[PDB]
């Protein structure tokens, strides 16, 4: 919490960029910390078709390391830097822990059952295929078909690097902000 401590010192934001984020961050939460209830207010504004509260709850837990209860600007930026301008390795572990709801690191088709459901839930019911009750399960079933060999952290890391299509989509936002 200095401005120079979170400078280009394993944080991928410049001095001017850190100033811009803090001005916008403190605008919504003047206290310097944003909580889960406010965390869902901004996220739901970007996606008005449905509700993003279900996905923001899982997103907040990934941001809120150590389950403190509120995420501070010091560790709010380092999550953005890893996700936006971070390396390949740092992005995958962050996303792996986003799906890994529990403490130990393991995905059992049920922890991320709500993760994929949240992505489909945050669209409302207005889509052309009119969605379905079992369409999130089909997405999960095909998702496991490409990394789940027998029944982990190592499997997730090597599977994404194997196919370049997801690789060129992870780095989508590093060029523009």
């Amino acid at each position: 919490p200095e401005g120079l401590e979170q400078l280009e010192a394993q944080t991928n934001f410049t001095k001017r960029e850190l100033q811009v984020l803090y001005r916008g961050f403190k605008n919504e939460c003047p206290s310097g910390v944003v909580n889960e209830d406010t965390f869902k207010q901004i996220y739901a504004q970007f996606f008005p078709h449905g509700d993003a509260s279900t996905y923001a709850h899982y997103l907040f837990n990934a941001f809120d390391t150590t389950q403190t209860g509120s995420v501070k600007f010091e560790d709010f930026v380092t999550a953005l830097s890893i996700l936006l301008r971070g390396t390949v390795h740092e992005k995958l572990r962050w996303t792996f822990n986003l799906y890994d709801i529990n403490k130990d690191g393991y995905i059992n088709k049920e922890e991320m059952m709500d993760i994929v459901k949240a992505i489909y839930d945050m669209m409302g019911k207005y889509t052309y295929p009119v969605l379905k009750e079992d369409t999130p399960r089909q997405h999960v079933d095909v998702f496991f078909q490409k990394m789940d060999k027998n029944k982990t952290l190592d499997e997730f890391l090597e599977s994404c690097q194997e196919d370049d299509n997801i690789m060129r989509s992870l780095q989508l936002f590093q060029n523009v902000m």
């Binding site: 120079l4 100033q19 803090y22 996606f47 008005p48 992505i119 669209m123 207005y126 052309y128 989508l172």
Partner: protein, 460 residues
Amino acid sequence: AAGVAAWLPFARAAAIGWMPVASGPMPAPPRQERDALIVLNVSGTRFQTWQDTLERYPDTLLGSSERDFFYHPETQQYFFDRDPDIFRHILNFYRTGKLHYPRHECISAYDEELAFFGLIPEIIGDCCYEEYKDRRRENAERLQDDADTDTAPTMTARQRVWRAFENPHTSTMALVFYYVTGFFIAVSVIANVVETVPCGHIKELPCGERYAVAFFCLDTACVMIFTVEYLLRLAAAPSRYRFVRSVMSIIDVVAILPYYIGLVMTDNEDVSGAFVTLRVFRVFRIFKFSRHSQGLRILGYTLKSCASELGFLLFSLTMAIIIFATVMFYAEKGSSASKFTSIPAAFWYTIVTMTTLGYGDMVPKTIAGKIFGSICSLSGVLVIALPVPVIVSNFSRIYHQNQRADKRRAQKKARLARIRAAKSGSANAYMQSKRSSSFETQHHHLLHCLEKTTNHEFVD
């Protein structure tokens, strides 16, 4: 402390007196480094204070390393995007140490600047803190009234029949039930009034000896209706025990008890000792009109709110009654034909005179008694006139705030409609872009990514 920091040379000068009576260990003075005023441009209006002024409170935004986020380097000034006429009171804190509340500024914006700059409402000066809390209370009550959760079938009929019981103005069955309950209460009380009055001989027989065969049927029908509606209310109350503990259920139980109590009493033997008591208790179905009329609820709320004032009313009334009854008894005792036989006998005269009622059957007949009777009348006026305005004022305030929260709910529904309209407009704006601003281009890319991560597309 750090607040008195310009007096450090004074404190260091005072320390010179210790040296003659000390044992100098070379206390190693810190040997500090060595003060131009800095600019705090809060959205156009530049504010200039010395840096040492801000540093004397190193736990807020202005005195900290936190303001390095708001430093604008090429202009050599700190640019904040906050209110220019509320940051004025922020700087006045760093000079004196006490915050001042502006009487002309909204308290929801004043608290926003205090939270932004790190100040707290606990350090505002005592000169204006009584007003700050009073204006904070009104804002707090505005939040509570707006967030009372008045919204009103995924589960059984209990909830959807309780919403009808709680709100009889909605639906079509709730209104019918409300009207039929009101009609039954009215016909029951009117039937009691009629059966009390004589209707028509050996004697002037009332309407309860030759008649009152069908009156008993009407009374038992009304009691049965009250019991069944109470049971239906019970079958839809999530707080069944707490609902019973509520005042309305207590009133309902008191209203329905007398018929069953009388039937039980008359099953085995019969005496007139509890007959008149139960007949008196039968009229307690009047108080069941509290649900029907908001006026009764407001009156009950205003009596419960100022319960202490009613206690003082009773205490002072008893005090004056006892004093004046004693005075009149000992002043009008030796009269020829005097009805002031005792102090309890003078209680009737005292309470008649104090309320300025007057009957003329029991009056003083002595020069000493008349003066004290007039003084008693004036003192009764004085005593009764004290708590009357506060009861009426509280009743008026409660009624106004209850009819003010009515439009507060109306503005909430309109506000949610605007939010939904914006959500529909934002969704529709994306479709127009898909068919054919600065931030809108980037925001629509996020929705485009959401479409193509699930191979789905939003449509109209």
